[PDB]
Amino acid sequence: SGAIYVGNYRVVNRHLATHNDWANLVWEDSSRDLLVSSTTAQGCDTIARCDCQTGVYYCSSRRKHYPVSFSKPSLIFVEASEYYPARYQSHLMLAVGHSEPGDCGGILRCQHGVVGIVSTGGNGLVGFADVRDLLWLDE
Ligand SMILES: Cn1cc(CC(=O)N2C[C@@H](C(N)=O)C[C@H]3C[C@H]32)cn1
Ligand SMILES: [Zn+2]
C-alpha cells in the first residue's frame, strides 16, 4: 500500500484504488496501473521532473529503503493477476531489488522529488510506475 499526495490529488496503484478513489476519480490508465483521485486536503509532495536513473525506494516487506539504478520508462510485459490479464504495462521502470505484491505503492524518489510508485515485481526485479511525465499533477 501507499500513495503520492500532491496539491488536491492522490496518486495510487489503479489495482489498489478504493471506492472513495473511484467516486472522486480525476484520471486512470489501466495500461500504467495508475489512478488519480481528488482530495479535500492539500498535498506537499514534490514530483521530480528529470531523466534520473538512480534513486531510493521504500520496501514495506523489509521496513527499509533501498538505493537502486532503474531503467527508462517503457512498455514491459507483465503476467496475469486477479487484477489484470497478461499485458504490456506502459511507463514502467525496472530495478534489481526485492519486492512482494503488498509493496505496491512504495515511493521511488531521486534528489528532485517523487519519481514513481512500486507497481510490479518478481524474480528479484522491482518495477515502478513513472509519474514524471504527468505535468498536470502540479497545476
Ligand atoms: C511490487 N510487487 C508486485 C508483485 C506482483 C506483480 O508484479 N503484480 C503486478 C501488478 C500490475 N501492475 O499488473 C498487479 C499486482 C499483482 C501484482 C510483486 N512485487
Ligand atoms: Zn531526478
Residue type, 48: A
Q: Are residues 53 and 93 in the same domain?
A: yes
Method of determination is X-ray
Ligand 2 ion local residues (Cβ < 5 A):
48, 50, 52, 110, 112
Residue 62 corresponds to which cell in the numbers above? 523489509
Q: Are residues 71 and 87 in the same domain?
A: yes
- From the list 29, 50, 49, the residue with the least C-alpha distance to 119 is 29
Q: Are residues 17 and 68 in the same domain?
A: no
Q: Are residues 110 and 57 in the same domain?
A: yes
Half-sphere exposure of residue 99: CA atoms within 13 angstroms, side-chain side: 28
Q: Are residues 40 and 60 in the same domain?
A: no
Half-sphere exposure of residue 4: CA atoms within 13 angstroms, side-chain side: 31
Q: Which ligand is nearest to the CA of 122?
A: 1
- From the list 28, 52, 55, 29, the residue with the least C-alpha distance to 132 is 52
Q: Are residues 95 and 134 in the same domain?
A: yes
Specify the resolution in Å: 1.4
Domain containing 139 equals 45-139
